[PDB]
Amino acid sequence: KNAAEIRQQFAMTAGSPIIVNDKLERYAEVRTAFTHPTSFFKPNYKGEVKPWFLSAYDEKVRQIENGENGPKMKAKNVGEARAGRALEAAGWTLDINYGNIYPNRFFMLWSGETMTNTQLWAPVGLDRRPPDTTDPVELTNYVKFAARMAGADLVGVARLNRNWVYSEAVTIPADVPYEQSLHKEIEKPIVFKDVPLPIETDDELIIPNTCENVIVAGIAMNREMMQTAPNSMACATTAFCYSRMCMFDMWLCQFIRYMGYYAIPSCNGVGQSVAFAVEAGLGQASRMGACITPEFGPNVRLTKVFTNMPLVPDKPIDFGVTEFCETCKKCARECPSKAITEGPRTFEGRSIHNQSGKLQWQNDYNKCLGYWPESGGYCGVCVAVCPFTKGNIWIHDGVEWLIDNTRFLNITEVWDGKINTYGLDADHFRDTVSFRKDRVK
Amino acid sequence: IRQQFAMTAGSPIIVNDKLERYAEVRTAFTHPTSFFKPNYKGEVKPWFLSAYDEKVRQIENGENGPKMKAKNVGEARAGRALEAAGWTLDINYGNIYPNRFFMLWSGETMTNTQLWAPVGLDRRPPDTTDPVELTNYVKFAARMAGADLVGVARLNRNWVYSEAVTIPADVPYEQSLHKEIEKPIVFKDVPLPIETDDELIIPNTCENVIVAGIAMNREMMQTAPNSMACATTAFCYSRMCMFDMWLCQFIRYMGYYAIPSCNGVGQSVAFAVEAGLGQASRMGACITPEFGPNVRLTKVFTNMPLVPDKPIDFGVTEFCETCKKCARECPSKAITEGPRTFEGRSIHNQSGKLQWQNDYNKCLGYWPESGGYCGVCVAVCPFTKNITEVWDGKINTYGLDADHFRDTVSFRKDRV
Numbered sequence: 048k049n050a051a052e053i054r055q056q057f058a059m060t061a062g063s064p065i066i067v068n069d070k071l072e073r074y075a076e077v078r079t080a081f082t083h084p085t086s087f088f089k090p091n092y093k094g095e096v097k098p099w100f101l102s103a104y105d106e107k108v109r110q111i112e113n114g115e116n117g118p119k120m121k122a123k124n125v126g127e128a129r130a131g132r133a134l135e136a137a138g139w140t141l142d143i144n145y146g147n148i149y150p151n152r153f154f155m156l157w158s159g160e161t162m163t164n165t166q167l168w169a170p171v172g173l174d175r176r177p178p179d180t181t182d183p184v185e186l187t188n189y190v191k192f193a194a195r196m197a198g199a200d201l202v203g204v205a206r207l208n209r210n211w212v213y214s215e216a217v218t219i220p221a222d223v224p225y226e227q228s229l230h231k232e233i234e235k236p237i238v239f240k241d242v243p244l245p246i247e248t249d250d251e252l253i254i255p256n257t258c259e260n261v262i263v264a265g266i267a268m269n270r271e272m273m274q275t276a277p278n279s280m281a282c283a284t285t286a287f288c289y290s291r292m293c294m295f296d297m298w299l300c301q302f303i304r305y306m307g308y309y310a311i312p313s314c315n316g317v318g319q320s321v322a323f324a325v326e327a328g329l330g331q332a333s334r335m336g337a338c339i340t341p342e343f344g345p346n347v348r349l350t351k352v353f354t355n356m357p358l359v360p361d362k363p364i365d366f367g368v369t370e371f372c373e374t375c376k377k378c379a380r381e382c383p384s385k386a387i388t389e390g391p392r393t394f395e396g397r398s399i400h401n402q403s404g405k406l407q408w409q410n411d412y413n414k415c416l417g418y419w420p421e422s423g424g425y426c427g428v429c430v431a432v433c434p435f436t437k438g439n440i441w442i443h444d445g446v447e448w449l450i451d452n453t454r455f456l457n458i459t460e461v462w463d464g465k466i467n468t469y470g471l472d473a474d475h476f477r478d479t480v481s482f483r484k485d486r487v488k
Numbered sequence: 489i490r491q492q493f494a495m496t497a498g499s500p501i502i503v504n505d506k507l508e509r510y511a512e513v514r515t516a517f518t519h520p521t522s523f524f525k526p527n528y529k530g531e532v533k534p535w536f537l538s539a540y541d542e543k544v545r546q547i548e549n550g551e552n553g554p555k556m557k558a559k560n561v562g563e564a565r566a567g568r569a570l571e572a573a574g575w576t577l578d579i580n581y582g583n584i585y586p587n588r589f590f591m592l593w594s595g596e597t598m599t600n601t602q603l604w605a606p607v608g609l610d611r612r613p614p615d616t617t618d619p620v621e622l623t624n625y626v627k628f629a630a631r632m633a634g635a636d637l638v639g640v641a642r643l644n645r646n647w648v649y650s651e652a653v654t655i656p657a658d659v660p661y662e663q664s665l666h667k668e669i670e671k672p673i674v675f676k677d678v679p680l681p682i683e684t685d686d687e688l689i690i691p692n693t694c695e696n697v698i699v700a701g702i703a704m705n706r707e708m709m710q711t712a713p714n715s716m717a718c719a720t721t722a723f724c725y726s727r728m729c730m731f732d733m734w735l736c737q738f739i740r741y742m743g744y745y746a747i748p749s750c751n752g753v754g755q756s757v758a759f760a761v762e763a764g765l766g767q768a769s770r771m772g773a774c775i776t777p778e779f780g781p782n783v784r785l786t787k788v789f790t791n792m793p794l795v796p797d798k799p800i801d802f803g804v805t806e807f808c809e810t811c812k813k814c815a816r817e818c819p820s821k822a823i824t825e826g827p828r829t830f831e832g833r834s835i836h837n838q839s840g841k842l843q844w845q846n847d848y849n850k851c852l853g854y855w856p857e858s859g860g861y862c863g864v865c866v867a868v869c870p871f872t873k874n875i876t877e878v879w880d881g882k883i884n885t886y887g888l889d890a891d892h893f894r895d896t897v898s899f900r901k902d903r904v
């Protein structure tokens with residue numbers, strides 16, 4: 048298997064592959080099902096209406112007391128049930144309020160100046176010295192090497208398409224401490240202005256007009272654990288990867304700053320990761336709505352960093368995902384909430400949670416979120432059943448690579464089974480080896 | 489290999505009745521007799537500020553290390569930018585202050601604990617007390633948390649620092665370096681790890697230590713003493729910090745307590761030897777079968793019942809007896825060519841244990857000179873096996889190497 052060959056074979060000519068029409072407007076982040084008032088509240092198993100994640104907490108507690116690893120899924124014993132939720136909770140250690148979405152708060156600072164690392168290194172002046180490299184070719188190789196050190200399994204570069212940057216972010220006022228954060232969330236516009244550096248005022252989050260590029264990282268989840276979806280070990284690989292995302296953003300932003308440029312971290316905030324990942328060539332959009340990659344299918348998390356560092360954009364990739372999703376529909380048939388459409392792509396949002404004006408499969412994300420308190424987790428059944436999540440999809444016919452169409456026709460064993468560092472799989476880890484030739488052309 | 493070379497139970501570190509616990513302030517990094525070193529202009533400064541001055545001089549002169557020309561100034565800058573960034577999740581080079589910043593001895597105030605409070609995992613008594621099942625659970629968690637190697641030992645208090653270097657609890661970060669103080673670490677009959685005005689208190693119930701190996705990148709370490717060796721060192725310190733926090737939270741959410749440490753609290757090499765990760769060596773590092781000495785260590789202390797691993801003997805002592813390659817290549821002649829003794833060469837060694845006694849002030853003195861963290865000893869050690877070619881060459885996630893990553897695969901059989 049040769050993952051670099053595969054990406055070269057399916058590379059497209061330059062240009063955003065996302066098809067849009069005149070109804071396209073930037074999307075206010077509060078509209079996501081996690082944050083919008085219509086979807087935020089969900090009943091728990093006693094019928095009490097609560098913030099969805101508190102209702103899900105109630106189900107986790109109920110499952111542990113009943114020796115279960117998920118909905119109607121008996122564990123080996125209560126201790127095993129406990130252990131899965133302890134692993135899940137611990138995975139979130141470096142993530143604020145399920146996704147790090149507040150810009151320029153906590154780990155997501157838009158300047159490095161107050162960070163303990165920046166203060167310690169201040170005598171060297173790396174963040175104040177003008178860049179010594181302005182060549183986009185060399186910078187792309189340097190920043191991608193740094194990205195791999197920082198924990199990305201995939202990395203790509205695109206020009207920043209502002210259509211996918213949230214029109215307004217969900218955040219908290221700068222004087223609000225963490226313990227009041229969930230009670231004091233506000234909206235704040237993200238605007239683009241002729242300023243030298245990213246800056247936040249009382250009224251606006253201001254991205255400079257010089258912010259040309261977005262660097263997108265893929266953070267691979269663990270296949271054995273995700274295949275337990277919707278049960279607790281799928282929750283644990285999800286959670287650990289959010290902390291890996293946070294570390295990636297902070298590491299990479301510091302590298303970029305110490306190279307003489309500015310950098311904006313984001314994790315789940317600032318803009319729509321799937322669209323950036325498609326434009327940076329990590330993969331293609333899919334029926335479930337995730338970015339499907341050749342190496343991991345959709346079983347990969349995304350984060351991204353915005354910067355004025357000159358870079359060479361990667362080419363988008365077309366390995367036939369759209370045509371497979373047209374005929375496959377496994378995620379839609381297996382979805383426990385029937386949130387995923389079995390119909391064609393349109394430009395018309397299904398509800399407030401979708402951004403209208405771009406051609407995509409339109410899914411009902413209030414239905415999806417509704418299953419999370421019911422199951423006490425983050426589901427993931429769609430990722431688990433997608434044939435691209437299997438490690439065995441690619442075959443070579445003597446001339447070229449192709450997808451094997453035959454692919455489209457318990458938790459105790461996970462705890463007792465194969466694992467390796469960060470949940471990566473040495474049987475496939477060669478797929479993400481990188482040399483200069485595949486970092487920049 | 490690890491099963492083939494398992495020893496019977498029992499600490500393999502030979503001691504005499506002279507041995508006493510070692511005050512952390514005695515390390516060359518911290519002690520007043522070794523802390524101040526001249527820069528290249530002759531100005532005496534804290535040694536790491538003099539090393540900063542050399543990094544700046546090298547960038548200006550288009551160098552990646554001492555008398556090592558870079559491809560250009562841009563390349564020199566990029567190596568130091570990568571090094572500085574690697575340290576993002578590490579306080580003041582090593583996270584040594586206990587119960588400060590990332591190294592909290594309780595999870596109660598952490599943002600993650602607060603968010604998860606309604607589930608009550610940290611307040612609920614353990615549902616598992618079987619050390620066999622716990623050892624399998626916690627080692628699985630350790631691999632998720634970024635350890636390439638993990639082992640368990642009973643806690644030997646001889647390797648716990650008698651007094652830690654820390655700061656007063658209300659001193660802000662901007663004043664930390666100027667207000668470092670000593671503070672005793674003591675063991676008492678208390679329910680939970682607790683810090684008073686006077687003492688860091690570890691419970692007498694704190695039976696076990698979990699030791700993690702965090703693998704460095706071979707291509708980058710082989711550029712020692714130049715900048716890319718500094719970068720793999722730095723990134724692994726941030727990996728250490730995330731490992732400690734992740735694992736401590738897992739242990740707490742299982743109903744036990746956990747003390748993180750990174751480079752603080754105690755001597756990692758001794759813990760790693762007792763937990764079976766590897767053997768002590770002439771250079772002083774723990775040499776592992778998978779990585780040689782090219783691996784960083786961190787550790788977590790806990791009352792969670794666990795099954796101790798066996799120490800390992802794969803012949804490092806006898807190999808180091810005749811090798812002496814690190815000693816001949818050491819740019820500061822810090823590593824001895826003589827035999828092992830129980831007598832330290834200076835304040836920086838803990839006397840009373842059989843080891844190769846090295847002069848660690850000589851080692852530190854080379855760091856301002858070279859503008860880095862050296863590492864030549866690690867780079868040349870047989871067990872471990874230009875900068876433009878590294879930047880243009882092979883890399884993979886976290887610097888791990890897919891040619892060898894199968895060596896750290898793990899199933900239950902090898903976890904307990």
Ligand SMILES: Oc1cc(F)c(F)c(F)c1
Pocket residue numbers: 081100144145146285286315425
């Ligand atoms: O983006 C996410 C937000 C959440 F609240 C979750 F629980 C989760 F697993 C992912």
Ligand SMILES: Oc1cc(F)c(F)c(F)c1
Pocket residue numbers: 513518519520653654668669670
């Ligand atoms: O000479 C000292 C060095 C240190 F690191 C201290 F913690 C201290 F109190 C005295």
Ligand code: SF4
Pocket residue numbers: 333334335336371372373375376377378379429432433434435
């Ligand atoms: S399961 Fe099938 S339809 Fe759904 S995303 Fe995967 S390939 Fe597309």
Ligand code: SF4
Pocket residue numbers: 335381382383384385386387414415416418425426427428429430
């Ligand atoms: S996460 Fe679960 S409920 Fe949501 S779309 Fe996927 S399968 Fe459906």
Ligand code: SF4
Pocket residue numbers: 817818819820821822823850851852854861862863864865866
């Ligand atoms: S780090 Fe360098 S100076 Fe220090 S002991 Fe090793 S070779 Fe010698």
Ligand code: SF4
Pocket residue numbers: 769770771772807808809811812813814815865868869870871
């Ligand atoms: S270089 Fe030789 S003597 Fe030194 S630590 Fe390695 S094997 Fe031992």
